[PDB]
Amino acid sequence: SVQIVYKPVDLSKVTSKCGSLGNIHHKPGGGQVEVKSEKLDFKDRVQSKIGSLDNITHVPGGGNKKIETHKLTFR
Amino acid sequence: SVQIVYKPVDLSKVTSKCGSLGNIHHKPGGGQVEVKSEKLDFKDRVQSKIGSLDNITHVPGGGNKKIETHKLTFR
Amino acid sequence: SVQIVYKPVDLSKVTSKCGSLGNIHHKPGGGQVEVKSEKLDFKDRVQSKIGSLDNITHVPGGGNKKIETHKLTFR
Amino acid sequence: SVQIVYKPVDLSKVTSKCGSLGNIHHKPGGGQVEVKSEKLDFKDRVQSKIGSLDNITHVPGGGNKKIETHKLTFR
Amino acid sequence: SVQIVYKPVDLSKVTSKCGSLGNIHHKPGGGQVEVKSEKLDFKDRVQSKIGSLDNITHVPGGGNKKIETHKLTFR
Amino acid sequence: SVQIVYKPVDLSKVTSKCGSLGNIHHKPGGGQVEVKSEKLDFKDRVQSKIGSLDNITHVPGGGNKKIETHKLTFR
């Protein structure tokens, strides 16, 4: 005779928490910002940001991947 | 006789929490922003952002992928 | 005689929470923004944003993908 | 604000296996039984079993009882 | 605001297996039974069984009882 | 604010295995049984078993009882 019993139990967490979670920003203040630009010459791409208070979150990561194989073979 | 019993149980979580979650921004102030530009000369692409208070979240990530394979081969 | 019983149970979650969730922005203030421009010259594409208080969420990510494969082969 | 989330999960077994299970009785032999009775006198109830091979299972027990009570009272 | 979410999940088993299950009785032999009776005298109820091979299952038990009570009371 | 989350998970077994499970009785032999009774006198109940090979399982027990009470009271 043969009896095979296959009863794995999984309660696992795979988890990510990414970027800005649960912060307190109590009354922050950006200063006065002044930009004067005169006679400038640009021969290639200009990428520009000007500002007093910038708050930025960027998240290319924080992804999750679970691979799970349950192979059983008899004879 | 042969008896095969295949009863795996899954309660697993795959989970992501990405970007800006549960933050408090209590009364943040952007300051005055002044930009003066004069006689400038751009020969290729200009990309520009000007502002007092910028609050940006960007999330290319945080994706999830579960691959699950149950296989039973008899003779 | 042969008996095969195939009773897998799944209660698993695949889940994503992406972008800006459950934040409090209590009375945020953008400052005055002034942009003055004179005699400028652009010879290729100009992309511009001007504003006092910008509140941006962008989410190319946060997707979910479950592949599940049950196979039972007899003789 | 109030949020109540009530998500109990039950996969429990209550199980009983009672009496004679999965036994092998390979070629059991009862012997010859002879009962001779003479001039006997019974003034009240007679209950009798006579036999060579008796194979008896009796199960007043093995019962199961699940009482389950979920209660949520608000104000 | 008030939000109540009531999502209990049940997959529980209540189960009984009573009496004679899955036994093998390979070629059992009852022997010769002889009962000889003379001049006997019974003044109240006679209950009798005579036989070579008796194979009895009796099950007053093995019953199952699930009581399940969900209650949600608001104000 | 109030948030109450009630997520208990149960995978418990309550289990009983009672009486005769998984025995091997390889070729047991009952002997010859002879009873001679003469001139006996019974003034009250007679209960009798005569036999060569008696193989008895009796199970009043082996019962199971799960009482489960989930209660959540708010104000």
Swiss-Prot record, chains A, B, C, D, E, F:
**Tau/MAP repeats located where?**
2-32, 33-64
Domain text from the record? The tau/MAP repeat binds to tubulin. Type I isoforms contain 3 repeats while type II isoforms contain 4 repeats.
Residues where Omega-N-methylarginine is found: R45
Subunit text: Interacts with MARK1, MARK2, MARK3 and MARK4. Interacts with PSMC2 through SQSTM1. Interacts with SQSTM1 when polyubiquitinated. Interacts with FKBP4. Binds to CSNK1D. Interacts with SGK1. Interacts with PIN1. Interacts with LRRK2. Interacts with LRP1, leading to endocytosis; this interaction is reduced in the presence of LRPAP1/RAP.
Q: What effect on the protein does mutating S48L have, as reported in its record?
A: In fatal respiratory hypoventilation; unusual apparent autosomal recessive inheritance; reduced binding to microtubules as well as increased fibrillization and aggregation
Found, by tissue, as follows: Expressed in neurons. Isoform PNS-tau is expressed in the peripheral nervous system while the others are expressed in the central nervous system.
**PTM comment for this protein?**
Phosphorylation at serine and threonine residues in S-P or T-P motifs by proline-directed protein kinases (PDPK1, CDK1, CDK5, GSK3, MAPK) (only 2-3 sites per protein in interphase, seven-fold increase in mitosis, and in the form associated with paired helical filaments (PHF-tau)), and at serine residues in K-X-G-S motifs by MAP/microtubule affinity-regulating kinase (MARK1, MARK2, MARK3 or MARK4), causing detachment from microtubules, and their disassembly. Phosphorylation decreases with age. Polyubiquitinated. Requires functional TRAF6 and may provoke SQSTM1-dependent degradation by the proteasome. PHF-tau can be modified by three different forms of polyubiquitination. 'Lys-48'-linked polyubiquitination is the major form, 'Lys-6'-linked and 'Lys-11'-linked polyubiquitination also occur.
Covalent link Glycyl lysine isopeptide (Lys-Gly) (interchain with G-Cter in ubiquitin), residues:
K7, K13, K17, K27, K39, K43, K49, K65, K71
Q: Which residues are glycosylated?
A: K43, K49, K65
Protein name per its UniProtKB record: Microtubule-associated protein tau
Which gene codes for it? MAPT
